[PDB]
C-alpha cells in the first residue's frame, strides 16, 4: 500500500496522505523519491470521535497509518521515535476533500496530539486554476499578463510536483493548535456523537444566503 522514501531520515522525509489511489499514483510519479513517501487513503476515513476504539483499531487506513508513521498511537505515543518530519494531507480541493481533511485532522488530534502540537502536520494546497492561480484574485491577474481543476486526478505528475509537492515551489498550511480548550469544543461539536449540538453549530455559523 505504502510507497516508502528511498533513504531513511526522520528529519527530512515527508509522508503524503493522499485522497484515493488514483491521485496516489500521480504523486508517486511526481514525488522526489529520495525523501518523499506516498500513502494513499482509500475512501472516506473513519470518524475516530464517533466510533469505538475497538472498531478504530480494526480500520485498515488507521492501522497502516500508525505503522508507517511508526510511533504507535494514543497515550503510548513517542514522537522522538517518529519516521517523518512532515505529515502532509493532500486532498482534492472539492468539498469532499475538505471532509477527508476534517476526519484525518480529528484523528491526529485525538490519538497523536504530540505530532500536531509540534507542528509536524501540514495540508497541501493544490491550484484551483490553470491558465497557475490558487485564489480567484490570482485568477484575474493571470488573465492580465482557463482550466478550472476539479481534483488531483486531472493533473499530470509533472504538473503536480511543480505546483504542490516541490518543497521550493509550494505553499503549505501548518496545523497549529493555538488554544487547547477552544479546539476541543471545536473537534467535539463537529465530529462527535451528539447531533443536536452540530445542527446548531451549522445553523449559527453556516450562511446559506
Amino acid at each position: 500500500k505504502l510507497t516508502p522514501a528511498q533513504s531513511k531520515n526522520p528529519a527530512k522525509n515527508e509522508l503524503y496522505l493522499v485522497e484515493g489511489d488514483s491521485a496516489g499514483g500521480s504523486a508517486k510519479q511526481g514525488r522526489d523519491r529520495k525523501f518523499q513517501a506516498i500513502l494513499p487513503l482509500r475512501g472516506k476515513v473513519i470518524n475516530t470521535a464517533k466510533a469505538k476504539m475497538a472498531d478504530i483499531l480494526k480500520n485498515e487506513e488507521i492501522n497502516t497509518m500508525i505503522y508507517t508513521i511508526g510511533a504507535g498511537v494514543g497515550a503510548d505515543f513517542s514522537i522522538e521515535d517518529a519516521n517523518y518530519d512532515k505529515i502532509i494531507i493532500m486532498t482534492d480541493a472539492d468539498t469532499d476533500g475538505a471532509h477527508i481533511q476534517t476526519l484525518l485532522l480529528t484523528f491526529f488530534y485525538r490519538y497523536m496530539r504530540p505530532l500536531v502540537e509540534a507542528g509536524h502536520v501540514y495540508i497541501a494546497l493544490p491550484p484551483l486554476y490553470k491558465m497557475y492561480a490558487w485564489t480567484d484574485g490570482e485568477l484575474e491577474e493571470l488573465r492580465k499578463q482557463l482550466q478550472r481543476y476539479k481534483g488531483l486526478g486531472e493533473m499530470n505528475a509533472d504538473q503536480l510536483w511543480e505546483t504542490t509537492m516541490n518543497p521550493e515551489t509550494r505553499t503549505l498550511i501548518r496545523v497549529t493548535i493555538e488554544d487547547l480548550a477552544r479546539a476541543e469544543r471545536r473537534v467535539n461539536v463537529l465530529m462527535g456523537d451528539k447531533v443536536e449540538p452540530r445542527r446548531k453549530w451549522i445553523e449559527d455559523n453556516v450562511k446559506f444566503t
Binding site: T95, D96, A98, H99, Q101, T102, L105, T106, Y109, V116, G119, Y122, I123, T171, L172, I173, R174, V175, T176, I177, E178, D179, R182, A183, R186, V187, L190, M191, N205, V206
Partner: peptide
C-alpha cells in the same frame, strides 16, 4: 508556509462540507 489554527482550519473545512 502559512500557519492556521486547528479550530480555524476545522471549522472552515467542515463548514464547506
Amino acid at each position: 508556509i502559512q500557519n492556521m489554527s486547528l479550530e480555524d482550519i476545522m471549522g472552515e473545512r467542515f463548514g464547506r462540507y
